[PDB]
């Protein structure tokens, strides 16, 4: 069958540390064949102008 290779890790700080950017995760993947490392839009606030 098939499963998730494995689970992350805890996440990095922002690109822009205030929520229009991205944050990042590593992990110990299980087999060779799968995805060790992901990105997602930040939960940060207060954005310069």
Same mark, same amino acid.
């Given at each position: 069958?098939?499963?998730?290779?494995?689970?992350?890790?805890?996440?990095?700080?922002?690109?822009?540390?205030?929520?229009?950017?991205?944050?990042?995760?590593?992990?110990?993947?299980?087999?060779?064949?799968?995805?060790?490392?992901? $990105?997602? $839009?930040?939960?940060?606030?207060?954005?310069?102008?």
């Amino acid at each position: 069958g098939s499963a998730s290779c494995g689970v992350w890790d805890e996440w990095s700080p922002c690109s822009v540390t205030c929520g229009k950017g991205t944050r990042s995760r590593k992990r110990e993947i299980l087999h060779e064949g799968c995805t060790s490392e992901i $990105q997602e $839009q930040c939960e940060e606030e207060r954005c310069p102008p």
